[PDB]
């Protein structure tokens, strides 16, 4: 299959409550494998998946240095963004970064990603060329110019086409029994009267990995997008995910409705009906 690696950085100021917290988590697809938290009693990079535990002390120390230095730089950055927006010293603010690489089925680099946000809004993003930037506003432009002057894009590109892909491939091999295993959804359809006139049909998908899945209801073969109730895909806590989709149908028309399930773990796309 295709695969990706992403790191997620969050830096949060908290005036009057110490220095900004910095937390980084790293993922391969929908599996987290490391964390670092500057608020930990003893801040260090910690493993979060079994297949990463085999990395040596040199690896853990290298990560910890990277995250410790970033912790300090993001505090500088929070101060800088406060000023770019003429903000008071009273408020809490957040910078987020998410970055990584995507591989195709052949293990080749599809593309790199490096995006940042301030208080939940796009701030600055590296373009797909891994060479130029897109700044959201005149504040982010100050950052753009400073990063252009310092040739930052060449640093990001060198990592994304180099170490990012190399290490993602390494992880994919070490954790191949799980990272390269798609588990198909266990499915079923439930039926619950809502009145004398109508009933709820709910289509369930459980125990699947990765999170990517498509669940849809059709009536007489037509998609019922607008009338379908679709909960967000949710983690079970054992690596797998869950989802359901619900539709309220005229009592007696149940057999006119079909649930369709697409998932990477499925050797064939599923069609289900309610089975009284």
């Amino acid at each position: 299959g295709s695969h990706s690696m992403r790191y997620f950085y969050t830096a949060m100021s908290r005036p009057g409550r110490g220095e900004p917290r910095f937390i980084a988590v790293g993922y391969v697809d929908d599996t987290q494998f490391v964390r670092f938290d500057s608020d930990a009693a003893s801040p260090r990079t910690e493993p979060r998946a079994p297949w990463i535990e085999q990395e040596g002390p040199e690896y853990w120390d290298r990560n910890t240095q990277i995250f410790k230095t970033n912790t300090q730089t993001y505090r500088e950055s929070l101060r800088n963004l406060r000023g770019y927006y003429n903000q008071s010293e009273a408020g809490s603010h957040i910078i987020q970064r998410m970055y990584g690489c995507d591989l195709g089925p052949d293990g080749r680099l599809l593309r790199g990603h490096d995006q940042s946000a301030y208080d939940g809004k796009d701030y600055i993003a590296l373009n797909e060329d891994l060479s130029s930037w897109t700044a959201a506003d005149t504040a982010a432009q100050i950052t753009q110019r400073k990063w252009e002057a310092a040739r930052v894009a060449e640093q990001r590109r060198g990592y994304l086409e180099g170490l990012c892909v190399e290490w993602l491939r390494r992880y994919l091999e070490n954790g191949k029994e799980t990272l390269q295993r798609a588990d198909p959804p266990k499915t079923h359809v439930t039926h619950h009267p809502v009145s004398d006139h109508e009933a709820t049909l709910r289509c369930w998908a459980l125990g699947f990995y990765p999170a990517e899945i498509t669940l849809t209801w059709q009536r007489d073969g037509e998609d019922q997008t607008q009338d379908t109730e679709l909960v967000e895909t949710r983690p079970a806590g054992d690596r797998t995910f869950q989802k359901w989709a619900a539709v309220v149908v005229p009592s007696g028309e149940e057999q006119r409705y079909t649930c369709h399930v697409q998932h990477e773990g499925l050797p064939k796309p599923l069609t289900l009906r309610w089975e009284p």
């Binding site: 790191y7 790293g26 990277i66 995250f67 230095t69 730089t73 400073k146 990063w147 640093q155 990001r156």
Partner: peptide, 13 residues
Amino acid sequence: LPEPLPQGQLTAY
């Protein structure tokens, strides 16, 4: 592996 530190000074925003 996350992005390594550059040889010079890590650039702030």
